[PDB]
């Protein structure tokens, strides 16, 4: 079934052990880095949501270990906050995780420059698309921190987020390394709550879906008709956004 399907696709389970997650994302990037000596930082936007938290502790928590276990004091977490124009979230996020450096861009003043120029070419955008404009700022705000400190950005993309490509292309979803990937919305909780982290860091989607539904579907239990079709319609949709530029050699496409 195209269920069963949408599952294998995501590397999705039925039930996971926090420890063992935990454990699993944090020697992936240990792993990485050691096999990429000449990387020195992971670069991580944090938004204080449940997301972006996971993601910062586990990078931290690689980044120590790495520290302790072969003495090179170069290694580093660099968080980094980036407001559109003007925290309470943020700021508990960023105690909980502890990073090793927090930089704070502000990018409303290039969003604006773009939008002038693209105004002087006679295009005006709508606010929907000035959303997805903002994240692809973010993007390159992170990429050019990367750039400079011989580091890779980390992404927050997991299985609750991938199936319905509720993320924008080349904004949040153009990153390097995503550790979260393969877990669903409640199961990031369960990781979280492992953690010991503050309870109210992490606790509708569209169309009347839920993170719920979306959880139940990708442990591959049954939701009703109407959900299932919702979901099953924005993955199809986004196919897109889940693999790299389209070439005369695909045909995943072709209907
Ligand atoms: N109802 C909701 O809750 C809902 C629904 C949809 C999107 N969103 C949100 O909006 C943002 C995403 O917006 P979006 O995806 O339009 O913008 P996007 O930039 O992520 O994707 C649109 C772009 O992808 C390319 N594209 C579109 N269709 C294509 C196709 N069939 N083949 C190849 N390329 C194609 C085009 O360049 C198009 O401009 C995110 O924040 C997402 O969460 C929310």
Not at 72 to 83: C, H, K, M, T, Y
Request: glycine share 8%.
């Amino acid at each position: 079934t195209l269920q069963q399907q949408i599952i294998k696709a995501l590397g999705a389970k039925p039930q996971i052990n926090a420890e063992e997650e935990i454990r699993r994302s944090v020697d992936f990037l240990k792993s990485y880095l050691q096999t990429y000596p000449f990387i020195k930082s992971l670069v991580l936007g944090i938004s204080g949501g449940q997301d972006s938290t996971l993601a910062g502790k586990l990078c931290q928590m690689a980044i120590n270990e790495l520290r302790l276990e072969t003495g090179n004091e170069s290694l580093q977490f660099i968080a980094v906050r980036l407001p559109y124009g003007v925290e309470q979230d943020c700021q508990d996020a960023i105690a909980f995780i502890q990073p090793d450096r927090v930089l704070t861009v502000n990018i409303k003043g290039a969003v604006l420059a773009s939008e002038q120029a693209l105004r002087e070419a006679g295009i005006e955008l709508s606010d929907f698309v000035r959303g997805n404009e903002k994240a692809r700022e973010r993007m390159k705000a992170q990429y050019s921190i990367a750039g400079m400190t011989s580091g890779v950005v980390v992404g927050t993309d997991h299985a609750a987020e991938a199936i319905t490509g509720f993320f924008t292309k080349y904004g949040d979803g153009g990153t390097d390394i995503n550790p979260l990937y393969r877990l669903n919305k409640r199961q990031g909780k369960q990781l979280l709550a492992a953690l010991a982290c503050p309870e109210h860091l992490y606790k509708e989607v569209a169309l009347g879906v839920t993170y719920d539904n979306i959880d139940d579907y990708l442990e591959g239990k049954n939701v009703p008709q109407q959900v299932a079709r919702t979901i099953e319609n924005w993955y199809l949709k986004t196919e897109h956004k889940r693999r790299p530029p389209i070439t005369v050699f695909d045909d995943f496409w072709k209907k």
